Paper text:
Ligand-induced [name] receptor tyrosine kinase activation promotes downstream signaling which triggers cell proliferation and survival. Sensitizing mutations such as L858R or delE746_A750 in the [name] kinase domain render the receptor constitutively activated, independent of an extracellular ligand-binding event. Acquired resistance to these targeted drugs is caused by a secondary mutation in [name] ([name]) at the gatekeeper position that occurs in 60% of the patients, inducing steric hindrance to the first generation inhibitors and thereby preventing inhibitor binding. Herein, we present covalent inhibitors of the drug resistant gatekeeper mutant [name]-L858R/[name] based on the pyrrolopyrimidine scaffold.
To our delight, we were able to solve two co-crystal structures of potent inhibitors in complex with [name]-[name]/[name]. This is the first report of X-ray crystal structures with covalent inhibitors reversibly binding to [name] drug resistant [name]. Outstanding potency was observed with compounds 19g and 19h, possessing the iso-propyl and iso-butyl ethers in the 4-position, showing EC50 values of 38 and 51 nM, respectively. O-Substituted inhibitors 19d, g and h were the most potent among this series of compounds and showed high activities of around 9 nM in the biochemical assay. The iso-propoxy- and iso-butoxy moieties form large interaction surfaces with the gatekeeper methionines, rather than steric interfering with the side chains as observed with pyrrolopyrimidin-4-ones. As previously anticipated, this might contribute to the high potency and reversible binding efficiency observed with these compounds. However, due to the [name] mutation, the acrylamide warhead adopts a position distant from the side chain and does not form any protein contact which might account for its high flexibility and only partial resolution covering this moiety. Interestingly, we observed an influence of the spatial size of the residue in 4-position on the orientation of the warhead and its linker. The sterically more demanding iso-butyl residue pushes the linker towards the mutated Ser797 side chain, which indicates that increasing the size of this substituent facilitates a ligand conformation that might more effectively target Cys797 in a non-[name]-mutant [name] kinase. Accordingly, a high potency against [name]-L858R/[name]/[name] was found especially for the O4-substituted compounds, which were found to take advantage of favorable interactions with the methionine gatekeeper based on analysis of two obtained X-ray co-crystal structures in complex with [name]-mutated [name].
Numbering used by the authors: 697 to 985, 997 to 1017
Write the structure that this text describes.
């Protein structure tokens, strides 16, 4: 396999500003802030994840593993790592996705979300996953909650917490016993802890169903324990009301038992691109037809998105 010559930038703490707290937890804390590289007339909006405890070796190995993965894949439609900071508590510096997770977005703006946006998001998530397949990366946790909103027009995959790089000449990843989201997993992942690009496709299909339902929960009210049996008996998620047969047939194909009978992300890109050219022909939706405050700072002249920084 090819040498992985990704670059990992180490950042000084003095060259970023934590402005606000987006979220906290036992994992750590995620700040909103600005990164000003010393000597460059540039200010980069960032999300900064800092560990709560500096003394957990397991937490430090996992955070660096996440950094390794993200640095090894740099692209649009993938949330970008800018660097890490090796302070008392390790910090990941990431590109700020101001509008949160797509799952929250469709739930808060269902009434104002049209077919054009829904299909473009589907195209974008496909381009992202097709890039990850090129990098021999298997995401293992694709879900509407793990796609974030840069702008309403532009979404990006993230939470590479469970993402695993495939070894050279290997097409499957055999995982150990661990907490994993059953409702988004392919049947072979559930029964045999097997993950591939094609199991990623299964999850893509569930992700699209979340979007097409405006944020509903798959198999709501059903224990994850009987999911395996439901899938084996041939059940699948139902057709969402706005979805023409054309769209739903794509989703269904994603949920075949034979992983090689599921589409490839390249084909999902093409097919959703076609539908994005005439969106109201494929989704029937009722009624279809400078932000310095965001950064809580006044001087925004030299602001540059990470997607333009190198
Ligand atoms: C627990 C998993 C998770 O992604 N947590 C989390 C918590 C807080 C913010 C973000 C986040 C956000 C983010 C999340 C929520 C919001 N909203 C919430 C809804 N509200 C109405 C407006 C503000 C805005 C931005 N943007 C990010 N960009 C890059 N990395 C991130 O997190 C990475 C470093 C883990 C994040 C993510």
């Amino acid at each position: 396999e090819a040498p992985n010559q990704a670059l990992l930038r180490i950042l000084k703490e003095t060259e970023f500003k934590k402005i606000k707290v987006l979220g906290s937890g036992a994992f750590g804390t995620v700040y909103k802030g600005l990164w000003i590289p010393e000597g460059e007339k540039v200010k980069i909006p960032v999300a900064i994840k800092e560990l709560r405890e500096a003394t957990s070796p397991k937490a430090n190995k996992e955070i660096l593993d996440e950094a390794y993965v993200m640095a090894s894949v740099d692209n649009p439609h993938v949330c970008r790592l800018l660097g890490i900071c090796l302070t008392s508590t390790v910090q990941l510096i990431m590109q700020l996705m101001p509008f949160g997770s797509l799952l929250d977005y469709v739930r808060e703006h269902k009434d104002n979300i049209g077919s054009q946006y829904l299909l473009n998001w589907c195209v974008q998530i496909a381009k992202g996953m097709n890039y990850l397949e090129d990098r021999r990366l298997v995401h293992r946790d694709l879900a509407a909650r793990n796609v974030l909103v840069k702008t309403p027009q532009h979404v990006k995959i993230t939470d590479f917490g469970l993402a695993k790089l495939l070894g050279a000449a290997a097409a499957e990843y055999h995982a150990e016993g661990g907490k994993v989201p059953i409702k988004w997993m392919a049947l072979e992942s559930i029964l045999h802890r097997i993950y591939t690009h094609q199991s990623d496709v299964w999850s893509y299909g569930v992700t699209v169903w979340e979007l097409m339902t405006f944020g509903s929960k798959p198999y709501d009210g059903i224990p994850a324990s009987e999911i395996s049996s439901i899938l084996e008996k041939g059940e699948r998620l139902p057709q969402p009301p706005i979805c023409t047969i054309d769209v739903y047939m794509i989703m269904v194909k994603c949920w075949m038992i034979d992983a090689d009978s599921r589409p490839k992300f390249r084909e999902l890109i093409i097919e959703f691109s076609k539908m994005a050219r005439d969106p109201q022909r494929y989704l029937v939706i009722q009624g279809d037809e400078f932000y310095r405050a965001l950064m809580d700072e006044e001087d925004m002249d030299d602001v540059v998105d990470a997607d333009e920084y190198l």
